[PDB]
């Protein structure tokens, strides 16, 4: 379902992120906690203040899991299998929350990629984030 054009777009946009992956993951998490405060209840023992080391730390793990998913775009269910198990079985994350984080990741990419975030690239990144969400909610 992710077309060759979509894979090209995702790889080109995500490749522009590069070394800023942790920074952008932390920014997307902060956007989510501020816009959708109920999402904070999933991290009760985190310091969720602006610029917190725990948020920065978690943002880099989220961004690296996305970088791994871009490299394994042809076999995403296998690559994110263990992560699908954690979110559904242990954390019990409500599937509506994946749409909230995906939106905040897209908003962060739009804010940092003025030239690259065209309507076609936006549609490709949306398809990619929806495919990751589908995989992460598949173990219910």
């Amino acid at each position: 379902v992710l077309s060759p054009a979509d894979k090209t777009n995702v790889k080109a946009a995500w490749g522009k992120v590069g070394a800023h992956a942790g920074e952008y993951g932390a920014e997307a998490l902060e956007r989510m906690f501020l816009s959708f405060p109920t999402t904070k209840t999933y991290f009760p023992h985190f310091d969720l203040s602006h610029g917190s080391a725990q948020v920065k730390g978690h943002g880099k793990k989220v961004a690296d899991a996305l970088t791994n998913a871009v490299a394994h775009v042809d076999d995403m269910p296998n690559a994110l299998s263990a992560l699908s198990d954690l979110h559904a079985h242990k954390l019990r994350v409500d599937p509506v929350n994946f749409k909230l984080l995906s939106h905040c990741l897209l908003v962060t990419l739009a804010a940092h990629l003025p030239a690259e975030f065209t309507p076609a690239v936006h549609a490709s990144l949306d398809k990619f984030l929806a495919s990751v969400s589908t995989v992460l909610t598949s173990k219910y």
């Binding site: 501020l34 816009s35 908003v107 804010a111 076609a120």
Partner: protein, 145 residues
């Protein structure tokens, strides 16, 4: 509801918005990113590619009507339901649009604002705009119930 600081941040960013272009950009992206929404715009002609959508004059003109309604909402934040009552009846009774799509258009508008403003579209500025677009989506869904 919006706090005074949120209401101020929303108005300061909105004054910088090009009213002739942002609506077309948000509508065009809705049609490209969620293609089932094209079912409602068959009268607009060619929407077969992202370039045909973004360059379509009817998409640009319709975006201006939509952005004008969002501006009307921004001037009546305490009475969104009343402000959008006739538009809500239209979208339900005449257009048959599922209200989930109102949430999708609000989120595409937030992405367009982030894209145009970059670093200026901070996490607190976005949080205020999320209240606005959810309030507009809920007012437009009101006459469905």
């Amino acid at each position: 509801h919006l706090t005074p600081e949120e209401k101020s941040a929303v108005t300061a960013l909105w004054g910088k918005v090009n009213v002739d272009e942002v609506g077309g950009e948000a509508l065009g992206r809705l049609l490209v990113v969620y293609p089932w929404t094209q079912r409602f715009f068959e009268s607009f002609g060619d929407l077969s590619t992202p370039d045909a959508v973004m360059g379509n004059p009817k998409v640009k003109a319709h975006g201006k009507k939509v952005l004008g309604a969002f501006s009307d909402g921004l001037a009546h934040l305490d009475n969104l339901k009343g402000t959008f009552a006739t538009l809500s009846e239209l979208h339900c009774d005449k257009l048959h649009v599922d209200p989930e799509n109102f949430r999708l258009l609000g989120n595409v508008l937030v992405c367009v604002l982030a894209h145009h403003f970059g670093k200026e579209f901070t996490p607190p500025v976005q949080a205020a705009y999320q209240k606005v677009v959810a309030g507009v989506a809920n007012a437009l869904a009101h006459k469905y119930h």
